[PDB]
Design an enzyme around this catalytic site. Sequence first.
Site, mmCIF file in Angstrom:
data_model
loop_
_atom_site.group_PDB
_atom_site.id
_atom_site.type_symbol
_atom_site.label_atom_id
_atom_site.label_comp_id
_atom_site.label_asym_id
_atom_site.label_seq_id
_atom_site.Cartn_x
_atom_site.Cartn_y
_atom_site.Cartn_z
ATOM 1 N N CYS B 31 36.450 37.427 46.125
ATOM 2 C CA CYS B 31 36.737 36.712 47.366
ATOM 3 C C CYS B 31 38.211 36.837 47.772
ATOM 4 O O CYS B 31 39.100 36.268 47.132
ATOM 5 C CB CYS B 31 36.309 35.249 47.223
ATOM 6 S SG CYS B 31 36.772 34.143 48.559
ATOM 7 N N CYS B 34 39.942 33.588 48.956
ATOM 8 C CA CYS B 34 40.072 32.695 47.800
ATOM 9 C C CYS B 34 41.366 32.973 47.042
ATOM 10 O O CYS B 34 42.026 32.050 46.561
ATOM 11 C CB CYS B 34 38.880 32.842 46.849
ATOM 12 S SG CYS B 34 37.279 32.441 47.567
#
Lengths: 214, 211
Positions: B31, B34
């Site tokens: 991600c 993230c």
Amino acid sequence: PMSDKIIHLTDDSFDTDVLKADGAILVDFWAEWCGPCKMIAPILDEIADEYQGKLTVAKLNIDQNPGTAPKYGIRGIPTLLLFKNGEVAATKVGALSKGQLKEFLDANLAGSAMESTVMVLRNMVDPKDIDDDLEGEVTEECGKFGAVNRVIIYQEKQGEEEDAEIIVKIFVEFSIASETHKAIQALNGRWFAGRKVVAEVYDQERFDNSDLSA
Amino acid sequence: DKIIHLTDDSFDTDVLKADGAILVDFWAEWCGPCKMIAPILDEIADEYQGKLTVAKLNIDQNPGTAPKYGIRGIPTLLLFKNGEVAATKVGALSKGQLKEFLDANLAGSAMESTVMVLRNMVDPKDIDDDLEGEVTEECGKFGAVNRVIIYQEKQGEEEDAEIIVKIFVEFSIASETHKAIQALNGRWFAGRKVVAEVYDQERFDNSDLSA
Ligand SMILES: [Cl-]
Ligand SMILES: [Cl-]
């Protein structure tokens, strides 16, 4: 037509008129000696006419009805409390222009109204009753109203106290709102089984954004 | 001073049953956003120590928890306080926007308040004209009490909704309030264990008793 669209409150009338009222209610706490209250008086009349159908304007004179205001932490006047379904949704303290009130109202009334694909089932399952089969059983049973996208078994603590009750909300997202509508109509008020279940629309934007609190 | 590593097994203890507010980050190694927010969360973890704990749940390693909260895309941040979901944030975010998110949802983080809120002390049915005076007498031990408000709130939009009681105690200065919160939080009053917390002073000053 064209008469007075403002609800004139008393201490005795407040519960019925505001807390058990249909739709958003804007409460104005005021007094005759209050200069800024008279400022917004004609503004409130316009707002009352222009937000017909989405807002009711109500006034409570704190001199004649002194019981209500202290319960809501009213300090200075005027104060506007915005109520939605017996809940204080927003507050505005002091006088403000017609534009500032509209801005406050627009931001605190539901925008982009829409029939949701999301159904929420309430009062159906106790947290202890939840098992590995429940999600699958719900999607299977709700699949007779249309295509089921996702089912969420959500547990919500109903307080901050250590042993506050946890309840279960069951979310069923359908592929399209027409399916959700059929499901809600068929399921609401029906018993499954031993518990009377509330089937209801749940805000789609909230759901899409992982807010399951409403 | 550092971030909790969550698992599906530890989540209940680490998050739901935790002392203080917990910011939960649902993430994964692949991600991109993230990783973008990781250094930001590091700074938030240090800067908000003793007020907030940051915690991360990798959704690949721990796939059980996130679907229970309706998590879709990652990153998603959930703010927990006393086992309740206080707020939610979806997607990446700047240091300032997260601070704004925290200011709006973490009582006391922008300013330590004169106002304490007492939760779970009394039932609506157990309220009388004596209660306000009893509270101010009991809270007088900690300092000058400006104002006590016995506030009744509907918990939800539906008519069925439970009515609860929040007891607001405003002191003259934030130091007194801090003493009061320390001494009252977690305390038992005739069968009930009370929650005593800071309440946002600005909300209270503006008659917003809803938080
Ligand atoms: Cl009037
Ligand atoms: Cl004790």
